[PDB]
Design a protein around this ligand. Structure first.
Ligand SMILES: [K+]
Ligand SMILES: [K+]
Ligand SMILES: [K+]
Ligand SMILES: [K+]
Ligand SMILES: [K+]
Ligand SMILES: [K+]
Ligand SMILES: [K+]
Ligand SMILES: [K+]
Ligand SMILES: [K+]
Ligand SMILES: [K+]
Ligand SMILES: [K+]
Ligand SMILES: [K+]
Ligand SMILES: [K+]
Ligand SMILES: [K+]
Ligand SMILES: [K+]
Ligand SMILES: [Mg+2]
Ligand SMILES: [Mg+2]
Ligand SMILES: [Mg+2]
Ligand SMILES: [Mg+2]
Ligand SMILES: [Mg+2]
Ligand SMILES: [Mg+2]
Ligand SMILES: [Mg+2]
Ligand SMILES: [Mg+2]
Ligand SMILES: [Mg+2]
Ligand SMILES: [Mg+2]
Ligand SMILES: [Mg+2]
Ligand SMILES: [Mg+2]
Ligand SMILES: [Mg+2]
Ligand SMILES: [Mg+2]
Ligand SMILES: [Mg+2]
Ligand SMILES: [Mg+2]
Ligand SMILES: [Mg+2]
Ligand SMILES: [Mg+2]
Ligand SMILES: [Mg+2]
Ligand SMILES: [Mg+2]
Ligand SMILES: [Mg+2]
Ligand SMILES: [Mg+2]
Ligand SMILES: [Mg+2]
Ligand SMILES: [Mg+2]
Ligand SMILES: [Mg+2]
Ligand SMILES: [Mg+2]
Ligand SMILES: [Mg+2]
Ligand SMILES: [Mg+2]
Ligand SMILES: [Mg+2]
Ligand SMILES: [Mg+2]
Ligand SMILES: [Mg+2]
Ligand SMILES: [Mg+2]
Ligand SMILES: [Mg+2]
Ligand SMILES: [Mg+2]
Ligand SMILES: [Mg+2]
Ligand SMILES: [Mg+2]
Ligand SMILES: [Mg+2]
Ligand SMILES: [Mg+2]
Ligand SMILES: [Mg+2]
Ligand SMILES: [Mg+2]
Ligand SMILES: [Mg+2]
Ligand SMILES: [Mg+2]
Ligand SMILES: [Mg+2]
Lengths: 189, 64, 117, 144
RNA sequence: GCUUGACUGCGAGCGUGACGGCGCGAGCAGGUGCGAAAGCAGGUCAUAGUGAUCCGGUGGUUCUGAAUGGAAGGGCCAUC
RNA sequence: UAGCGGCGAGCGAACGGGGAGCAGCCCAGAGCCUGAAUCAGUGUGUGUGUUAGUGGAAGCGUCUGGAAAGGCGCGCGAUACAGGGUGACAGCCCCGUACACAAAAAUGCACAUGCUGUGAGCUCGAUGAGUAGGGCGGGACACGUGGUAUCCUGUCUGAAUAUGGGGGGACCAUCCUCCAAGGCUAAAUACUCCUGACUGACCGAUAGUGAACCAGUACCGUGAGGGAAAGGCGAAAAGAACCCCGGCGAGGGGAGUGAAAAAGAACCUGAAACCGUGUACGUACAAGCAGUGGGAGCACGCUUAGGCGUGUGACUGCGUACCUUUUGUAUAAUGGGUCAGCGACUUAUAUUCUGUAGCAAGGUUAACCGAAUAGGGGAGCCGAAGGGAAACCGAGUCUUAACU
């Protein structure tokens, strides 16, 4: 239109939703636990005899019914990562990239560079382009543009290899070098 | 972990093309002299598991 | 994701206790008792929306009967007479007329008497 | 298209049952387990095939047959697979290279399943009467 | 009187069972008896006379046979 | 899966394949040539870490306020907008952070180079015996003695030793393959009492450690051992000079501090049960789940000047709590003194069905590689063919000598 199958396909919301959700699920650390009744510190002594005392029968001081007792279904560390089918991932990226074009959020440039590793230069470059919140996608990792962008929270600088579906949706605009477009097309076919 | 096959069921039932199970008939191991030839002849071919029993067989044979 | 119940639990208990205002003793103070009291109040109110219609009709009939007998006719004959006269005035209105406009009630009785005789 | 304007497909995300959360839910109190008995209990319920003590079906029926070791190393090739090998010679090795059969398959048979439309040499494999006709119809040779 | 149909392989269809099963069955193939022949015979007027599976035994059958040829063991059929 | 298995419950391989990581050696002995190879040990250097540190950008005005970091206005730094603190929320106030530097002394590591052991290389050899194997008893092998190979050995025995021996799942032959009865050996692997940094759809004081607090304490127990409760004034103590009642009390009232003391130390918020004081209405001729439907009166408010609303509720119809368990409960069956807080269908993996999404006669990868949620990796798995116990045949196949 670049490839039409990549940059001019219909927005499959359900597919994009699954891949975005999976991405966020992949970010989860899942590091936690509680103590079951097995793991709470204490004796296995029956707190009082089964019969005759007039109290509800007790077995463990660690019972989850009890204050200070175990958690009934104590959490363990979990892996929250989902499988995303390769084709569903690539399908979602094509839908996202195509929507960015339809919404006028993908800007393509022949080159995007700054001279020195200086945040002031990039800030001035961006405000000349009517940009503020922007994913900049370059063909390669450039030191100076990366270092310039690091302290700008609204700005992220990637290579073509490190695109992800959340970032394409998250940033208001997406600047792509012409070289990055070639690589992203090559990626997605 | 993986479900374990009930190994005794795997020795008694074979899954057919449309997902039924064939089995060998009971009553043809011994005490054969008193049984009519007709009765024994009808017990020789394999038979299909009935509808009432398929649930029990399927439970026992998750990897059939 | 531990959820503490306090704020929601409080809100629910308060909602019930607000509905139990005016009730005696534990019924206006204590959630366990107030909850039963509020449920029962609702059961009775449901029942008594039906009973109210029964009780008011019963009251109207009693008053029509009194007013009819002042005018020399039973309730049962009066109603039969009005039906034969093709008067469709209902018991609520008849009972109200019986109290507030005794001359119009007398005219209804006279109409009813004419229909039977 | 924002992170707060993406929805799942309708019907794709059904809410899980939560038992024992009050009358309204329809799963309050007993949690769909009914009243009492082994099946109401935590960890309760009989093993697979158990029929209450009646000799179960998988024990009142006789065992039959044996398992063949040869069948595990025997495969069936479809006619559709004949054009997936490289070079147009269908041997045991060329099928293995094309990932049609597993590496430990020693015996393979071409059956009349799918279709063939190229001259293929089949070598060292059994071929069904129908497969042989189909291979030969498309100009192929069955070398034994 | 003469005989071995108390046959072997099957079986349209049906009955009766939760199921395992159990029952009735014309007809088809092979081979048989009795009858001049039509025919009849797959036990007995019928309905009881029974015991799943496992394990193992015996006979048959190269179906299988852990390098290969065998064998063992297993399978299948008959039977205990 | 193959198998094992009162062939029950269950137990459960290997071959082969894909990966991580890879590394080979020595003695059973002399001779020749010599100490040459390679790791050890103990020094000197050499870098490079560690054990203190150093520098480290840029903001003001005005508004609200007790206080400004907030609002508003206009600036500035950013390889630093990690984070923390500061009288409310600070890139620019402070401590940091990015980044760039630093060691007198000790010491980890990687090398370079002495010294002392160490012996490389070549030819000639040699080639682990109470052992292998066996009988008996056990045990181990996924394998329960089974047709049971193989391993270990308590007991009794007992070879051949390279022209020999072991194994190839009873056993034999053939063939193939390996060389026991001597030993050493890095990496990939396991773990965290402990140290540093960093992270969390982990907890937030009945939670999270038993322990946020002088807690393994108090306390209990002869002892082993058991084992708590208990966090928050304020920005700052400015923690209330002084006066008054009181016992030179407790406690309080003023005063003063403070934005606030109804933040006063029994201190943030300050629920509920529970207990009071005040006011309105009702209530001392009246029988019961205490409400509900009807309803007068009284009090207090309000916009037809009217009714209306709020509280109360004389009188009157109806009316035996809830849960549980049951054929059935007001039941004199069960449970609950009340409140508050906590307290029960989860998690992992496998499997099937449904929905939904992708791709479609294909679908999908696992470990792993990759800083890479990418990309690679198709080893596998499921499916597109079944029938038969099986050989085997195959849109058929099995059955049977053969099928109507
Ligand atoms: K940035
Ligand atoms: K249920
Ligand atoms: K015949
Ligand atoms: K300001
Ligand atoms: K700050
Ligand atoms: K021995
Ligand atoms: K040999
Ligand atoms: K404890
Ligand atoms: K505690
Ligand atoms: K009443
Ligand atoms: K009872
Ligand atoms: K009792
Ligand atoms: K499932
Ligand atoms: K699905
Ligand atoms: K057929
Ligand atoms: Mg706890
Ligand atoms: Mg991948
Ligand atoms: Mg038999
Ligand atoms: Mg929380
Ligand atoms: Mg109250
Ligand atoms: Mg229900
Ligand atoms: Mg119950
Ligand atoms: Mg019951
Ligand atoms: Mg039940
Ligand atoms: Mg239990
Ligand atoms: Mg393959
Ligand atoms: Mg007879
Ligand atoms: Mg008889
Ligand atoms: Mg047995
Ligand atoms: Mg063999
Ligand atoms: Mg062998
Ligand atoms: Mg600074
Ligand atoms: Mg404040
Ligand atoms: Mg040796
Ligand atoms: Mg040996
Ligand atoms: Mg031995
Ligand atoms: Mg032996
Ligand atoms: Mg043993
Ligand atoms: Mg051997
Ligand atoms: Mg605690
Ligand atoms: Mg608290
Ligand atoms: Mg004082
Ligand atoms: Mg206050
Ligand atoms: Mg204090
Ligand atoms: Mg505060
Ligand atoms: Mg307070
Ligand atoms: Mg009286
Ligand atoms: Mg009175
Ligand atoms: Mg009384
Ligand atoms: Mg009553
Ligand atoms: Mg009873
Ligand atoms: Mg009753
Ligand atoms: Mg009773
Ligand atoms: Mg009771
Ligand atoms: Mg009582
Ligand atoms: Mg009871
Ligand atoms: Mg009680
Ligand atoms: Mg097949």
């Amino acid at each position: 239109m670049v490839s039409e199958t990549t940059f001019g396909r219909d927005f499959n919301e359900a597919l994009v939703h699954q891949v975005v959700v999976a991405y966020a699920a992949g970010a989860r650390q899942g590091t936690r636990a509680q103590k079951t009744r097995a793991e709470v510190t204490g004796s296995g002594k029956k707190p009082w005899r089964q019969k005759g005392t007039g109290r509800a029968r007790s077995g463990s001081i660690k019972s989850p019914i009890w204050r200070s007792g175990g958690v009934t279904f104590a959490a363990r560390p979990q892996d929250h990562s989902q499988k995303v089918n390769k084709k569903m991932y690539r399908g979602a990226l094509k839908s996202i990239l195509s929507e960015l074009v339809r919404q006028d959020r993908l800007i393509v440039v022949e080159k995007f560079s700054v001279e020195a590793p200086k945040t002031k230069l990039l800030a001035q470059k961006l405000k000349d382009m009517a940009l503020e919140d922007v994913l900049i996608i370059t063909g390669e990792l450039d030191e100076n543009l990366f270092l310039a962008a690091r302290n700008l929270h609204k700005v992220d600088v990637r290579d073509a290899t490190g695109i992800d579906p959340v970032s394409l949706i998250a940033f208001d605009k997406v600047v792509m070098t012409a070289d990055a477009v070639k690589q992203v097309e090559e990626m997605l076919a | 972990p993986k479900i374990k096959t009930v190994r005794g069921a795997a020795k008694r039932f074979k899954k057919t093309g449309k997902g039924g199970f064939k089995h060998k008939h009971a009553n043809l191991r011994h005490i054969l002299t008193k049984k009519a030839t007709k009765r024994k002849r009808h017990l020789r071919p394999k038979a299909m598991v009935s509808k009432g029993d398929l649930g029990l067989v399927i439970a026992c044979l998750p990897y059939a | 994701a531990r959820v503490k119940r306090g704020v929601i639990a409080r809100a629910r208990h308060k909602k019930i206790l607000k509905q139990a205002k005016g009730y005696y003793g534990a019924r206006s103070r204590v959630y366990r008792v107030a909850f039963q009291a509020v449920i029962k109040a609702g059961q009775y109110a449901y029942r008594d929306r039906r009973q109210r219609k029964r009780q008011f009709r019963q009251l109207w009939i009693a008053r029509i009967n009194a007013a009819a007998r002042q005018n020399g006719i039973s309730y049962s004959k009066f109603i039969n007479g009005l039906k034969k006269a093709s008067v469709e005035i209902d018991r609520k209105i008849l009972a109200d007329i019986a109290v507030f406009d005794k001359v119009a009630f007398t005219a209804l009785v006279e109409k009813a008497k004419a229909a039977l005789a | 298209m924002r992170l707060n304007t993406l929805s799942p497909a309708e019907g794709s995300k059904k809410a899980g049952k939560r038992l024992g959360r009050g009358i309204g839910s329809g799963l309050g109190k007993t949690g769909g387990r009914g009243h009492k008995g082994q099946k109401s209990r935590s960890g309760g319920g009989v093993r697979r095939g158990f029929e209450g003590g009646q000799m179960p079906l998988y024990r009142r029926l006789p065992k039959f047959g044996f398992t063949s070791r040869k069948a595990a190393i025997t495969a069936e090739i479809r006619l559709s697979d004949l054009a997936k090998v490289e070079g147009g010679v269908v041997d045991l090795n060329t099928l293995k290279a094309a990932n049609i059969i597993g590496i430990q398959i020693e015996f393979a048979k071409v059956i009349l399943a799918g279709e063939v439309t190229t001259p293929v040499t089949v070598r060292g494999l059994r071929v069904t009467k129908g497969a042989r006709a189909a291979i030969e119809a498309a100009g192929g040779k069955i070398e034994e």
